[PDB]
Design a protein around this motif. Structure first.
Motif, PDB file in Angstrom:
ATOM      1  N   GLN A  63       0.770  -1.244   0.000  1.00 46.54           N
ATOM      2  CA  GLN A  63       0.000   0.000   0.000  1.00 46.54           C
ATOM      3  C   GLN A  63       0.791   1.278   0.000  1.00 46.54           C
ATOM      4  OE1 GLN A  63      -3.263   0.138  -0.525  1.00 46.54           O
ATOM      5  NE2 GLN A  63      -3.559  -2.083  -0.461  1.00 46.54           N
ATOM      6  N   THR A  64       2.055   1.270   0.499  1.00 45.13           N
ATOM      7  CA  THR A  64       2.742   2.538   0.610  1.00 45.13           C
ATOM      8  C   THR A  64       4.064   2.666  -0.102  1.00 45.13           C
ATOM      9  OG1 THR A  64       3.810   1.891   2.601  1.00 45.13           O
ATOM     10  CG2 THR A  64       1.641   2.941   2.848  1.00 45.13           C
ATOM     11  N   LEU A  65       4.626   1.571  -0.676  1.00 41.14           N
ATOM     12  CA  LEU A  65       5.882   1.781  -1.401  1.00 41.14           C
ATOM     13  C   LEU A  65       5.655   2.806  -2.494  1.00 41.14           C
ATOM     14  CD1 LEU A  65       7.562  -1.764  -1.791  1.00 41.14           C
ATOM     15  CD2 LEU A  65       8.281   0.119  -0.325  1.00 41.14           C
ATOM     16  N   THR A  66       6.593   3.678  -2.654  1.00 45.04           N
ATOM     17  CA  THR A  66       6.540   4.701  -3.688  1.00 45.04           C
ATOM     18  C   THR A  66       7.069   4.166  -4.998  1.00 45.04           C
ATOM     19  OG1 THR A  66       8.793   5.516  -3.204  1.00 45.04           O
ATOM     20  CG2 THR A  66       6.964   6.559  -1.967  1.00 45.04           C
ATOM     21  N   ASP A  67       6.900   4.944  -6.074  1.00 40.50           N
ATOM     22  CA  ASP A  67       7.441   4.601  -7.386  1.00 40.50           C
ATOM     23  C   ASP A  67       8.949   4.336  -7.224  1.00 40.50           C
ATOM     24  OD1 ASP A  67       7.943   4.431 -10.238  1.00 40.50           O
ATOM     25  OD2 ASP A  67       8.146   6.635 -10.371  1.00 40.50           O
ATOM     26  N   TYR A  68       9.670   5.272  -6.564  1.00 42.71           N
ATOM     27  CA  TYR A  68      11.117   5.082  -6.366  1.00 42.71           C
ATOM     28  C   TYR A  68      11.433   3.762  -5.616  1.00 42.71           C
ATOM     29  CZ  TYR A  68      15.924   5.607  -5.052  1.00 42.71           C
ATOM     30  OH  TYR A  68      17.273   5.352  -4.904  1.00 42.71           O
ATOM     31  N   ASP A  69      10.715   3.479  -4.545  1.00 40.69           N
ATOM     32  CA  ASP A  69      10.928   2.255  -3.753  1.00 40.69           C
ATOM     33  C   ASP A  69      10.659   1.006  -4.586  1.00 40.69           C
ATOM     34  OD1 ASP A  69      11.562   3.773  -1.523  1.00 40.69           O
ATOM     35  OD2 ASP A  69       9.457   3.754  -0.825  1.00 40.69           O
ATOM     36  N   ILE A  70       9.620   1.036  -5.441  1.00 35.65           N
ATOM     37  CA  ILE A  70       9.323  -0.142  -6.260  1.00 35.65           C
ATOM     38  C   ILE A  70      10.524  -0.426  -7.185  1.00 35.65           C
ATOM     39  CG2 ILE A  70       7.846  -1.041  -8.111  1.00 35.65           C
ATOM     40  CD1 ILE A  70       5.593   0.649  -6.642  1.00 35.65           C
ATOM     41  N   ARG A  71      11.082   0.631  -7.790  1.00 37.15           N
ATOM     42  CA  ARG A  71      12.234   0.473  -8.692  1.00 37.15           C
ATOM     43  C   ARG A  71      13.426  -0.045  -7.913  1.00 37.15           C
ATOM     44  NH1 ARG A  71      11.736   4.959 -13.308  1.00 37.15           N
ATOM     45  NH2 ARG A  71       9.728   5.924 -12.752  1.00 37.15           N
ATOM     46  N   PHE A  72      13.639   0.522  -6.721  1.00 34.92           N
ATOM     47  CA  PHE A  72      14.760   0.171  -5.857  1.00 34.92           C
ATOM     48  C   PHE A  72      14.719  -1.317  -5.516  1.00 34.92           C
ATOM     49  CE2 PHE A  72      18.124   1.098  -2.850  1.00 34.92           C
ATOM     50  CZ  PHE A  72      17.988   0.101  -1.900  1.00 34.92           C
ATOM     51  N   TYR A  73      13.550  -1.788  -5.033  1.00 28.15           N
ATOM     52  CA  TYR A  73      13.433  -3.188  -4.633  1.00 28.15           C
ATOM     53  C   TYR A  73      13.425  -4.131  -5.808  1.00 28.15           C
ATOM     54  CZ  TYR A  73      12.925  -1.728   0.229  1.00 28.15           C
ATOM     55  OH  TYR A  73      13.124  -1.231   1.495  1.00 28.15           O
ATOM     56  N   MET A  74      12.860  -3.710  -6.947  1.00 26.01           N
ATOM     57  CA  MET A  74      12.934  -4.547  -8.139  1.00 26.01           C
ATOM     58  C   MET A  74      14.383  -4.768  -8.558  1.00 26.01           C
ATOM     59  SD  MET A  74      10.016  -5.700  -9.434  1.00 26.01           S
ATOM     60  CE  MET A  74      10.359  -5.760 -11.250  1.00 26.01           C
ATOM     61  N   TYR A  75      15.232  -3.724  -8.457  1.00 23.28           N
ATOM     62  CA  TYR A  75      16.656  -3.826  -8.777  1.00 23.28           C
ATOM     63  C   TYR A  75      17.338  -4.815  -7.818  1.00 23.28           C
ATOM     64  CZ  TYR A  75      21.142  -2.304 -10.733  1.00 23.28           C
ATOM     65  OH  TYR A  75      22.391  -2.241 -11.334  1.00 23.28           O
ATOM     66  N   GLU A  76      16.975  -4.758  -6.522  1.00 24.88           N
ATOM     67  CA  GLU A  76      17.544  -5.675  -5.534  1.00 24.88           C
ATOM     68  C   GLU A  76      17.150  -7.132  -5.862  1.00 24.88           C
ATOM     69  OE1 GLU A  76      19.807  -4.819  -2.992  1.00 24.88           O
ATOM     70  OE2 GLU A  76      19.765  -3.033  -4.253  1.00 24.88           O
ATOM     71  N   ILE A  77      15.890  -7.364  -6.287  1.00 23.21           N
ATOM     72  CA  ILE A  77      15.455  -8.730  -6.680  1.00 23.21           C
ATOM     73  C   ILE A  77      16.265  -9.200  -7.906  1.00 23.21           C
ATOM     74  CG2 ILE A  77      13.563 -10.195  -7.520  1.00 23.21           C
ATOM     75  CD1 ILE A  77      11.634  -8.163  -5.972  1.00 23.21           C
ATOM     76  N   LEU A  78      16.480  -8.291  -8.883  1.00 23.84           N
ATOM     77  CA  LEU A  78      17.257  -8.654 -10.085  1.00 23.84           C
ATOM     78  C   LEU A  78      18.675  -9.088  -9.734  1.00 23.84           C
ATOM     79  CD1 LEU A  78      15.887  -6.027 -12.574  1.00 23.84           C
ATOM     80  CD2 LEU A  78      15.700  -8.570 -12.760  1.00 23.84           C
ATOM     81  N   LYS A  79      19.295  -8.478  -8.704  1.00 20.89           N
ATOM     82  CA  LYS A  79      20.653  -8.873  -8.262  1.00 20.89           C
ATOM     83  C   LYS A  79      20.628 -10.336  -7.821  1.00 20.89           C
ATOM     84  CE  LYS A  79      22.151  -4.438  -6.468  1.00 20.89           C
ATOM     85  NZ  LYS A  79      22.449  -3.733  -5.187  1.00 20.89           N
ATOM     86  N   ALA A  80      19.582 -10.744  -7.072  1.00 14.07           N
ATOM     87  CA  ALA A  80      19.439 -12.116  -6.603  1.00 14.07           C
ATOM     88  C   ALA A  80      19.213 -13.051  -7.754  1.00 14.07           C
ATOM     89  CB  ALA A  80      18.273 -12.217  -5.632  1.00 14.07           C
TER      90      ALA A  80
END
Ligand SMILES: Nc1ncnc2c1ncn2[C@@H]1O[C@H](COP(=O)(O)OP(=O)(O)OP(=O)(O)O)[C@@H](O)[C@H]1O
Ligand SMILES: [NH3+]Cc1cc(Cl)c(-c2ccccc2)c(Cl)c1
Ligand SMILES: [NH3+]Cc1cc(Cl)c(-c2ccccc2)c(Cl)c1
Ligand SMILES: [NH3+]Cc1cc(Cl)c(-c2ccccc2)c(Cl)c1
Length: 327
Positions: free
Chosen positions: A124-141
């Motif tokens: 409910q509260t992740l921002t556009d920036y946070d979504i990109r940030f965490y998606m990048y972290e998942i891609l590293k894995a």
């Protein structure tokens, strides 16, 4: 028969590594001391295990104990070998120990604890920036595990722990992960319904790491469009129809014709004909803050029927959607 397929990346990883790396059945488990751990509270139970918060009383650290049920206990060496092989990798959960639970008489995997932020709160509260940030972290894995010759096969938000306070992400539940071997036919009864790739839905067994990239696209579409799940199938057949209502039936037929796959004739009564939709169709005033031209282009390059046509994890990291993310 079906046309064979092989991954376009990391095809040779399990060939050049020694047999001890991927031959998980030959692995000898070095059993730890169950007495080193004290169970504190039950966190949950799935169909594969019961999960507990625990304390390692020898060094006072908080741990998570996954006590396997007999079904996941048979394929233990596979999950153990995968966890040991990936240990230390970016955003991969750390397996700390393997013990024998005295009550269940089954193996219990002990992991590092992650102070996971409430999942509803993050949705409910992740921002556009946070979504990109965490998606990048998942891609590293994902690039790490793919580069190590392993496909996760169960990528979904429930399998990603986020400690939002410390901007820390871990990919967990490697119970369905497999070593990728070119030409190997895998079981299509992997992944949760809403995250299943078209390859699974059409019974195409010679799939690869790219299945994880479809699942990743499903997670992103749900998040940015505020539509949980994005492809809302009533069952595995309606799952493919829901996909076809977005990607269209002409590209589905091109896909199955490329691999000489036939659909189950039961699709004649339910599939119909559908055009490919433009991704802007899913935008509205309640989700526009999470959408951008880059997000739509990125999603377009993940959510493709042809598993060979999807972005790889490493290609995905190069996408303009992540230019704003601090590296
Ligand atoms: N390392 C961990 N830290 C915290 N919770 C975990 C961890 N591993 C598993 N879990 C919990 O147990 C489930 C495992 O399946 C997760 O969805 C989560 O709720
Ligand atoms: N289990 C917690 C959780 C919650 C969320 Cl909202 C997400 C997420 C992040 C970015 C894009 C899509 C989904 C993940 Cl990966 C995990
Ligand atoms: N190309 C797929 C397809 C195939 C068939 Cl056989 C039919 C069908 C089903 C019942 C009665 C009449 C026609 C339809 Cl509508 C679609
Ligand atoms: N968050 C602001 C935002 C959101 C969206 Cl969805 C778009 C857009 C407009 C037309 C086509 C494709 C994308 C733009 Cl330009 C900006």
């Amino acid at each position: 028969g079906p046309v064979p397929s092989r991954a376009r990346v990391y095809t040779d990883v399990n060939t050049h590594r020694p047999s001890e790396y991927w031959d998980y059945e030959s692995h000898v488990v070095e059993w730890g001391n169950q007495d080193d751990y004290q169970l504190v509270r039950k966190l949950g139970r799935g169909k594969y295990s019961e999960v507990f918060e625990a304390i390692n009383i020898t060094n006072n650290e908080k741990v998570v104990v996954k006590i396997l049920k007999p079904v996941a206990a048979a394929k233990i060496k596979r999950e153990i070998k995968i966890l040991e092989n990936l240990r230390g990798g970016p955003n991969i959960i750390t397996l700390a120990d393997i013990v024998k639970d005295p009550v269940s008489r089954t193996p219990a995997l002990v992991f590092e604890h992650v102070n996971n932020t409430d999942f509803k709160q993050l949705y409910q509260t992740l921002t556009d920036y946070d979504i990109r940030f965490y998606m990048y972290e998942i891609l590293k894995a994902l690039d790490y595990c793919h580069s190590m010759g392993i496909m996760h096969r169960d990528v979904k938000p429930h399998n990603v722990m986020i400690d939002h306070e410390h901007r820390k992400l871990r990919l967990i539940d490697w119970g369905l992960a497999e070593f990728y071997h070119p030409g190997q036919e895998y079981n299509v009864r992997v992944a949760s319904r809403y995250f299943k790739g078209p390859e699974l839905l059409v019974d195409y067994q010679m799939y690869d790491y790219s299945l994880d990239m479809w699942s990743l696209g499903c997670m992103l579409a749900s998040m940015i469009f505020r539509k949980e799940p994005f492809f809302h199938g009533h069952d595995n057949y309606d799952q493919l129809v829901r996909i076809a209502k977005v990607l269209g039936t002409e590209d589905l037929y091109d896909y199955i014709d490329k691999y000489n796959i036939e659909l189950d004739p039961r699709f004649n009564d339910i599939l119909g004909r559908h055009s490919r939709k433009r991704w802007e169709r899913f935008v509205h005033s309640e989700n526009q803050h999470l959408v951008s031209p880059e997000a739509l282009d990125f999603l377009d390059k993940l959510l493709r029927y042809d598993h060979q046509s999807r972005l790889t994890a490493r290609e995905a990291m190069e996408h303009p959607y992540f230019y704003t993310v601090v590296k």
